[PDB]
Structures are given as structure tokens and as C-alpha cells.
Design a protein around this nucleic acid. Sequence first.
DNA 1: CCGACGTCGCATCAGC
DNA 2: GCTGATGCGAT
DNA 3: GTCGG
Length: 321
Amino acid sequence: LNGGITDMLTELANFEKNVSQAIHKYNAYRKAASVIAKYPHKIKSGAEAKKLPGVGTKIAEKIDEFLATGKLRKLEKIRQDDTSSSINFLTRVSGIGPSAARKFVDEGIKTLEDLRKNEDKLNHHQRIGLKYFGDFEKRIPREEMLQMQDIVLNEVKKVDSEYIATVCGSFRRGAESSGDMDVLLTHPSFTSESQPKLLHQVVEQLQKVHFITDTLSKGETKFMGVCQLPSDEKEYPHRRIDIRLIPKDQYYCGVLYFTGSDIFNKNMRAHALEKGFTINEYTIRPLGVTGVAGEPLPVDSEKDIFDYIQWKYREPKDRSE
DNA sequence: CCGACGTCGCATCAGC
DNA sequence: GCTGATGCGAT
DNA sequence: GTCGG
Ligand SMILES: [Mg+2]
Ligand SMILES: [Mg+2]
Ligand code: NA
Ligand code: NA
């Protein structure tokens, strides 16, 4: 329908974020690319697009140009630019954002090769991003995700049978593949102000059984790293895994948010707002007579939240929006 | 015309 | 050495 | 870049 338009907008989005360092323009282009991707008609003019929320004058004009010529002069130019295309490209390495990408490129470090020759200039996260550059862009079929979940539940329950662990993200919604694995962890000993080894013990056991292979970051509540399923057949790609330790009374807010989708949480938070409730990742709080958030409300399941805002409990599988 | 546009854990930097 | 700022990746 | 107070 409109793939050349949404690809153009997304390509424009990356340059804003990665090259121009204009995060708000990057979000503007993505919002336009979104509303256009969900629009069930081949767009015939910019004015037609201008009607969607998030498509403004400049994007209307760009669609017009793309439609008359099949390209954008500005995009063609930026694509052929050595500095800018390299800056944009290097940011595909996890841990290299717009600012590290610019410094590298300033000093002639432009490709994954140049990064290979220059490990001493790279921090821990950046080497791991480089090391698994290829793997980190592969998707994870559900079947692998299920084997990954097997290992995670087994090993956590093994460390202490009173842990509760839930694998969230698109996997929880029954998606056919996933980009990474997001595990939320709680324990009856952990509430609000309340060991700082409850997370460490889990990471430890999963390294012990060679499931977790590398660490990007780890503190007392959040872990970010890499894992790989065990292999005379072909080895599995290395995967991103995050592990979060959330207090008991915030756990179900956490589970809901990190189940997504993006848009579902958008809509739900919005519907929530009009019923005079505000839901963040931690709490659901009732907005008082003048806009004052009061106390976090007691929550013991996902359903509890869904009740408060008089919404119908939704299965994770119907949470695209 | 002009400000908002998400918010925060962790790693690491800049400054004292 | 410590403190607060900044960069990054993110439902 | 778009929106909206
Ligand atoms: Mg026990
Ligand atoms: Mg994730
Ligand atoms: Na519009
Ligand atoms: Na990156």
C-alpha cells in the first residue's frame, strides 16, 4: 500500500536521531510512519496523508515529492554522504548511540572492521554489541523462546522455590517470534523499602549452567545481558535477555507494562486517565479532586488493575492495542 | 508564537 | 575519592 | 516535525 512512504519516513527518522541528534524529530517521523502503516488505502497525495494525526505540512510535501519522482532529493543526498551514513550505520551496534557513533566517525572509525581494529577505544557494552552484531539483529522464533523459558523457570525455582518469574514482552502475547527475552522476578521477601543478592543469585545460577554468556549491565534490580541455548548440530544465535527484580506490591504493574504492546499500554493508560486513574510501570494511583495523584492502590494480579479502571480483563494475546 | 515531545537503571565521564 | 551529569537502551 | 495551549 504505502511501504515506500513508511520506509522513507523511517529512514528519515534514523538520521534525525542518529545524525542530527534531534530525538523529537525522530519520534515525529516514526509517529507518521505508524499512522500511515495502519492506513488501509494506497495514498495518492500528501494532502490525503495530511489528514492523519502526526502528518503535517513538511511530511505532506515529502509524500508529494516521493509520489512524483519515486525518491526524495534530501534522502538520496544524505544516503550518499560518507560521514552521515557511517554515523547512522555504526549506531546499529548496541551500546553505540549517536554520540559515540559521531566520535568514532570523526576519527576515521567508520565500519565494523574499523571497530574490530580498535577494541581499546570501546567500552564493555560496545565490544559485546560488536561481538554479536549479527546475532542481535536476528529474531527469536517462539519455539526457541519456549526452550529459553524452560531453562529460566527451572533455574530460578531451583535457586529458591519461592521466586515468582514471568517472561513478558511479545512472547507473553503469544507472538510467533521475539526480539529479546524480558524476565520479571519477584520474591515474598522483597517489597518497597525492604536482599541485594536476590537478583545476583539468579544471574549466577544461569551463568553456572552456561545459559547466560555475557553481561552488559547488572545492579540490584536490573540485569541486561546475553544468553544462548545449548547446542553435533548448528549452534543457536546469542540472544538479548533482561532480568528485572521488582518488589512484590509493584510486580503486577510491572508485568502488565512489560507485556505491552507499546500501543496497548498507550490506549490502556489513556482510557485509565479518563476514569480518573494514572498507571505507570510501578503503581496505579487515583487522581484527586484537582489532579493530585494519591496513594498507590493495592494490586495482587493483573486483573486488579483492569478492575479499578472498569475495563474488561484482556488476555495477553489480545493486547496489540 | 513557542514549549512539550517518557522516564529511569546502570556505566562511565567531568568536575571538584 | 565523591557527586552529579551524560549516554545508552528501552513497554 | 507536529500538535496545541
Ligand atoms: Mg524452598
Ligand atoms: Mg527488552
Ligand atoms: Na495531520
Ligand atoms: Na546502538
